[PDB]
Amino acid sequence: NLTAAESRIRDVDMAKEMSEFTKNNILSQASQAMLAQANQQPQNVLQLLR
Amino acid sequence: NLTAAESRIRDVDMAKEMSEFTKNNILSQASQAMLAQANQQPQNVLQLLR
């Protein structure tokens, strides 16, 4: 029972962690994506410039 | 947020600046133009002279 509670503290429910990992990785790829949109804003500033 | 306000101070809204530039350049070409009319005033003074 000590091992049980000790595991409830430290040892992870790796399913939940994996869902958290896939989730956060999507947030990451979404963010890099929004750089791929964000940097594209001043080139249109160059477009009215020319 | 510091970068944001710092940019609001120094960094320019280049669209507005470009409109200002085209504008003032037209005022310039209009002014050179009005030299092309202004210097032409005394040659007619030479015309009644001859």
Nearest chain B residue to A48 by CA: give it.
Answer: B15
* Residues on A contacting B at a C-beta cutoff of 8 Å: 45, 48-49
PDB resolution in Å: 3.8
Contact B14, A49 (CB under 8 A): yes
Q: Which residues of chain B does A45 touch, with a Cβ-Cβ cutoff of 8 Å?
A: 14-15
* Alpha-carbon separation of residue B28 from A29, B22, B23, B43 (angstroms): 50, 10, 9, 24
Q: How far apart are the C-alpha atoms of A38 and A35, rounded to whole Å?
A: 5
**Structure-determination technique:** cryo-EM
User: From the CA of A44, how many Å to the nearest CA of chain B?
Assistant: 10
